[PDB]
Design a protein around this ligand. Sequence first.
Ligand SMILES: [Ca+2]
Ligand SMILES: [Ca+2]
Ligand SMILES: [Ca+2]
Ligand SMILES: [Ca+2]
Ligand SMILES: [Ca+2]
Ligand SMILES: [Ca+2]
Ligand SMILES: [Ca+2]
Ligand SMILES: [Ca+2]
Ligand SMILES: [Zn+2]
Length: 456
Amino acid sequence: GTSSAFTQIDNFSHFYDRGDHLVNGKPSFTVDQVADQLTRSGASWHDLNNDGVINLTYTFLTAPPVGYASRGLGTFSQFSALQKEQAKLSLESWADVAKVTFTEGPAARGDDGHMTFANFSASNGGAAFAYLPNSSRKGESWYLINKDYQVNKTPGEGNYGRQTLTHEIGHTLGLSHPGDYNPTYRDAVYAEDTRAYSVMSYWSEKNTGQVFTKTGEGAYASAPLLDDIAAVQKLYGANLETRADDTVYGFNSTADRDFYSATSSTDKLIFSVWDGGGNDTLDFSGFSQNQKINLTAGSFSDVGGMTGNVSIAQGVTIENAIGGSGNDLLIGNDAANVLKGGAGNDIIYGGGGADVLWGGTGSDTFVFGAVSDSTPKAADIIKDFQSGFDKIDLTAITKLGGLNFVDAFTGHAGDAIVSYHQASNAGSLQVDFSGQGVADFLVTTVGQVATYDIVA
Ligand SMILES: [Ca+2]
Ligand SMILES: [Ca+2]
Ligand SMILES: [Ca+2]
Ligand SMILES: [Ca+2]
Ligand SMILES: [Ca+2]
Ligand SMILES: [Ca+2]
Ligand SMILES: [Ca+2]
Ligand SMILES: [Ca+2]
Ligand SMILES: [Zn+2]
């Protein structure tokens, strides 16, 4: 067996596993499988000028097009400045992940296509609608506005007015709904068909167990989520030029995107991280709720008192993570990561590569699941180890067999050596798991480590 600390880590890393199993009686689909499902119509824009990207233009209509009255949409009206500002933010988030550009202007000669945005007042027209890129109205999207329906009048980060724009633009890009779909999630074709995985879904995250808000309140992702991202990149290619240098997401964010920014402990973040390279950090230092942060590509995290609301896109490598003042879990990846616990009692799992770990205040547990996690040639470093408070857990390696603390390796498996260098305040832990008479596991610390601070 293992310790509770390790079990909590292993559980969270598998908590959102997708594929090859039944969930809610429906098949669980992987991100790749969903990317195919959302693009099953075959409709897309084309690179007419062959420059390796889809360059599109758009116009905020100022007057009803020819044949407009035959649509039955009622009174025509131009987008307001608010809508124009939000539409641009929606277009931008799509342009960040896929090789597509959107430039305001009239249909031009070298464009691969043209888009249009406008409003109507006749409810019969629905809350909003768009057309696929292979239709005769390719590029068009329409939004309802009247006394009885006002959500499109004040679109804004986090509200349905903004996700609507992002959703309709999705359609114009060639994305379909997760299913053909009175309809309910029961009619879904796969399990992850909820707004927790894709803004194209009609169902709430509640169907899959996630928790974003309370009744009476609304909370919707403003930008393309995990599956949406995969879907569009599969169509137009991933944009690696986006934020290719060091980036911070969340608190103290440097991503310059409203939906990746947190300035209050009450903020509700719902996003999927797309990044192009560099040493990146997920800073969630401003929240007081227990969190669970996973730096694995394509994985989900429970951020700011919510669950399954944050994720990293497939093919993205994020290097660092900062917990809040609650008791959190932090899981790194194969890269060298800087993992910060913050206040509270945290459990930190470095993974592969030499990692830098910071417990913070509170009793913290640095967990190791394999020997390859902290080797002599690539050992982790605990910068703030507090003897008699913190612990080093090797329970997943020793499986509770214990260690034999000695001063020098005798050539027996399980021999462990805890040393301290009172001059540099540096401590270390060595062990001979294989029993070859030399160390095959090393953990360096800034702060004296004792024999009792080790759990095995
Ligand atoms: Ca082009
Ligand atoms: Ca970056
Ligand atoms: Ca990176
Ligand atoms: Ca913490
Ligand atoms: Ca690591
Ligand atoms: Ca600590
Ligand atoms: Ca801590
Ligand atoms: Ca490691
Ligand atoms: Zn739709």
